[PDB]
Symmetry: D3
């Protein structure tokens, strides 16, 4: 499970303020082949949508899409005007109370994932 | 390895006071699908037996059975008078000295496990 | 993935005569460590129910339960009046037309499973 | 390894007429949860390019892209004008003489893959 | 599970003429990355010993050792006087009657293995 | 993934002082079957070589060989003048700055590995 195109997804973090929709999501991305990538992708909104592109940060050139249904992750990354990588992952997690409300919840991943990057056709 | 019927077993803990039989066993059980289960199952006895049902706690409605031979775990849970789940797992571990005796040992799991629940026929 | 108490489950087969309930179910069990076990477990009923013990065959001293819900299998072997082992698996499968009436379906496994037997406490 | 949005990819097949580019590629997709999907996706071109969408077949409403570099597969299913799913796999394979001219090669998968579909955002 | 130095081991075959020691052993090695390697490694002796190097065949420049204890395989390829690679696998198998005398047994693999080659230091 | 011959490799640590060659390497080895092995194997040199035997410590009776190319590990252990075990593993990792130089780097493993021991023929 190493390789120049394999990444370790880890440290998944979610905030469900009314116990339903996320208002915050993030995770960490690490190199696997002794490379140097150690990046925490993260987004916030008042009511985040399933199956919607969000940026991971300004100048990250990365976007993700999340489906809370089955905790599925879509990951995309522009590398040039010609190369784009994409990857799918699943991110197991549990929730515990957040105390910033009655129905406030904190979601933490309970397992790491290892994605393989594929090149997205320019179409 | 997510799902509404998948659980993460973790934080395995054992006490072998004379270096043989356990006198204490426990582990943690977490949800995997963003659910809320975060429970530490645990039992104690002067000399615990292999292949014997033990409660995980009062009002847990859960019992487990352990086989120290191959570190195998049986997990059972009453959900109603009609539904009972069971699962099998294996729990790798090592021991280190406990210092509360010459042949005292502490056992800690070295890997998480992911069980799938099946329904136990009422027979 | 080998061992004295590890078995391969394969060749899963069921019939849905009206394309709903099974009226026949079966699979094969092989040894894994150079043992000699190569046993085909199978059962029939007019309409089979999920989560109900069925015999694997006369003088097999084995029983199983199946949940078509999540393709969960529960396996039980009586070795003696004093020793019983159990195990759990998931059996991925697909369906297709059986040819005996338009609503007739045949289900086949599409993936091997490897089970680990644990001792069931007596009482 | 089962689910409503889990598919088995198997029976991978490609032709390298001069033993370099593919001029034909295909594989099979089956359901995993007792579903009925058993679809063979295949495409041809004079010389196929890596990282380019190809149709799986007329009225399949499916497309795929393949990278012979790392045997990466990208799969896309249009379910409606409003819903599209995607998935990623790696398809281990080997080559051998095809017999139609000395430089002719045939590639076969040597391992099944199991994909998980996620929803692709619209826009 | 692909790579330039990843091989599939399959089609394991041994003969226990008296149902104890092997007097014949073999398996197949295939490439995994669209390579062309499809080599069948096999050896015979009057009575074969565990944990002893055997040749895979004349001018194969390969050797293996097998432990019927835990079905462990050790594989060695001499590429040149300067480069040797090694790898390790476990080969799940079962036995059955061979038909050539009552004590005659045939062993077959029941699961593929995927090995990773590493360089063996010289000296 | 337990067994009397299975070990957990963990806590991989590497030092690449000029950003290339390692000058230090180490990792931890733990029992998996409730045994007592908890050992940190480690070596240092001004410029460490790929594919070279290094001791894990005085009186460890263990040597390893590393290939930084694909982060592959060879592990060997003398148990008597008659028994020697060997195992192969792969050890995913990433690097971050070390600050003891411009091109100084610290490598930490990002995933555990589970090796199976095989017996090395005496030849």
């Amino acid at each position: 499970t190493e390789g120049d195109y394999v990444w370790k997804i880890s440290e998944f973090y979610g905030r469900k303020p009314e116990g339903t929709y996320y208002n915050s999501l993030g995770f960490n991305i690490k190199a696997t082949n002794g490379g140097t990538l150690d990046f925490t992708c993260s987004a916030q909104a008042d009511k985040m949508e399933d199956h919607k592109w969000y940026s991971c940060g300004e100048n990250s050139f990365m976007n993700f899409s999340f489906g809370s249904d089955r905790s599925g992750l879509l990951l995309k990354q522009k590398v040039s005007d010609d190369i784009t990588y994409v990857a799918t992952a699943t991110l197991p997690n549990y929730c515990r109370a957040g105390g910033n409300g009655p129905k406030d919840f904190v979601c933490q991943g309970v397992a790491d994932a290892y994605i393989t990057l594929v090149t997205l056709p320019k179409s």
